[PDB]
Design a protein around this ligand. Sequence first.
Ligand code: ZN
Lengths: 189, 191, 94, 52
Amino acid sequence: REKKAEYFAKLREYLEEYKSLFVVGVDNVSSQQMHEVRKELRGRAVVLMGKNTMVRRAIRGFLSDLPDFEKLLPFVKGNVGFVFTNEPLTEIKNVIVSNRVAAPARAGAVAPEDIWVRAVNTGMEPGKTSFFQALGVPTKIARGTIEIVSDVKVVDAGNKVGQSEASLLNLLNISPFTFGLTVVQVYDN
Amino acid sequence: MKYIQTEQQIEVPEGVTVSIKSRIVKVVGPRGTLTKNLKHIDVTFTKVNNQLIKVAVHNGGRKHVAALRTVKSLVDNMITGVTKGYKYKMRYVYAHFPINVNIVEKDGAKFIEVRNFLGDKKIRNVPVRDGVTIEFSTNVKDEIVLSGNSVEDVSQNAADLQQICRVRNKDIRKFLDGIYVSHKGFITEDL
Amino acid sequence: KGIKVTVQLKIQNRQAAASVVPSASSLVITALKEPPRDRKKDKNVKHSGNIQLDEIIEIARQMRDKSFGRTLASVTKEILGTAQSVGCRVDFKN
Amino acid sequence: IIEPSLKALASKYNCDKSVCRKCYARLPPRATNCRKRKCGHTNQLRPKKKLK
RNA sequence: UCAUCUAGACAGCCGGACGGUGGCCAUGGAAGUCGGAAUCCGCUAAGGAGUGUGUAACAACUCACCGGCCGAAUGAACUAG
Ligand SMILES: [Zn+2]
């Protein structure tokens, strides 16, 4: 026993006094969205959707790691992760204020509503946006006063995204789709 | 090399039962009956005691022993189907041209019509075979469900439909409107 | 706050557009230390120090890039304060 | 109104396989060896959401 | 030929972004190399200046010895019929 102590006989043994519970599942989301918000108070969060080393655990049986884990006891198949966090949830709405410049999401996912935001002039040259033959964007300009000739809806929810349609369209510095709740349980003993 | 004797266990519950002729197999259970012909490789079956049928073969190569587990999969899957039922949920998706699907009986045939698929205007027909039924899924938008006892018939029908709803001469990754499976399960749950 | 920035990904709203910090992963240190930080941080960056500010570092010892873990006085003197960006009172060693 | 006599033979052949997203390159199902001309066609394969 | 197994690993899901990542071009603006050099440390289960990288960087995401039941041969590179 040389390296295993640094995980079992070190971290868990020095923090075998936790009674919090934050069970989350990354089914299909931008991983860093949940990761940075689990962090920010960095150094107290690490995903550990584990593996099957419980035969060895029972061989060395003297853990008593989480007695509050008796709820999904017939779920020995892709179990949730033994992650240790004891953070508060009354911090984001008072301590941190006026961020407003975070990074957008993957840029490409499906939006909830069909919205066309009005574009303001900036004084730049046209870029590499000569790929729109399929559906396109019929528009007309007349010194700022823009006029759309026909509307197009591209896709609904429940379908994967294209490849080269996220270059110079969303130039407002807005995250297109984070806006959701993904969590299995949030308890304290 | 030359595995002189290799076998595989297969279980059967008490409610159902099976009768094996020289080469034909016939399962019977609460949901119904089923039959199948095994004139393909000729491997032996041996009863033990009302619950355990051992499939067995003697002296063969890997090509000759692979058929053993293949027929094990065939028989245990089909008895699972006749004792538990199978179902396939497929979904519709459309970009701008919504689909129009319907079921139409004529001369005891029961075909299915598809319309407004990318703007076509003469019938896209497809037939259905026995032992399987379909109901348009209530309280949910743009789905269909096949349900039956066997698996080869229903899977072939679903594949036939999802292959018929194909398009050419358009962009190869922008157009993704058609029909495709989504869920594969049983008519019952955990039984 | 701070001109330094680490990777991030959070939500957005209100049609925002500003040139400020995007809430990096190490702003709790700035919150617990003194307010001023944007100033005297042009080019001079200190890779030295030996200061212990808040006595709730047992939790940061775990996986906040754990400095020492076992030896309480082998690498703590080299990592703590060196990883800190509180003050630039004297510049004598990098 | 169009007729199947024209629609079928217009859309009969074999446009159907997986799709790529990154570097504008999907690869077919079969596998002999590496991607280059001496070899060709890697061993990637996966189902698709909708046939294109 | 070479490495692991009854001191029981494979095929049934995950992520790793502390300082450098705010590194240089006639003192009102250049946040991980458009026009050119370089990829290590204290850290030592997490803990990278990256194969690709939104206005002609300021707002950059995916992935790496680690971790939940059962129970036995599997993995890699070559040789010729
Ligand atoms: Zn190749």
